[PDB]
Symmetry: C3
């Protein structure tokens, strides 16, 4: 019936949205891993530059991304909790 | 009952979609803040390294430092966040 | 006309979800371009610092590899492309 088409399309919407949620979780998890790597690399190279300049007035800048990565984790958790079970 | 149940499921889909919109906005805004901080730090350390090499060669070859410009990318992230903001669902029931 | 309203709302949900898919694709593509530039810049300046320290004696430098992460972002973007809704 047209109502059966309504039910089918509604199930399709739920299916597509849940798959898209999976994709977004992947994207944000990967962005967080990359941000961790970026923070660590910049801070290691800042420490290297500071050590070298100390050997021989140069101040190096350090990166702190903890709050941002925590926020990304919270967003991923919300995405996990936003899955849909049609009755 | 399929009728009222269908209406219930439609409201549930709208609710979940709007919550997910909130989560995505949070993620992209936080990514933008992190990119701003990364750009600023990399450029500060590039300036420090250039200062050291210039200070030294005038006290053997020039080392060229690379600068980071993420402004267009952060503008695009802001546009995506705005579109996500405008994509909320207001059902008619 | 509750059913016609139900169909109307269903089309609205699909329309909004697809528009949001477009926004997410834009965000992740731009984040990947930014990660490309960040990796390249950090590695270029790492090479510069290693060169300076090598010549000034003629410290361990750290290099960044984000390739797996960027490949993963591209996969997420592709799945987002494939998640579009064509209602009947
Ligand atoms: Cl529906």
């Amino acid at each position: 019936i047209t109502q059966q088409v309504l039910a089918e399309n509604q199930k399709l919407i739920a299916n597509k949205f849940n798959q898209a949620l999976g994709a977004m979780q992947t994207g944000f998890t990967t962005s967080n891993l990359a941000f961790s790597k970026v923070q660590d690399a910049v801070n290691a190279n800042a420490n290297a530059l500071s050590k070298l300049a100390s050997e021989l007035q140069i101040n190096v800048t350090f990166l702190d991304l903890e709050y941002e990565m925590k926020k990304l984790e919270e967003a991923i958790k919300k995405l996990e909790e936003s899955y849909i079970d049609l009755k």
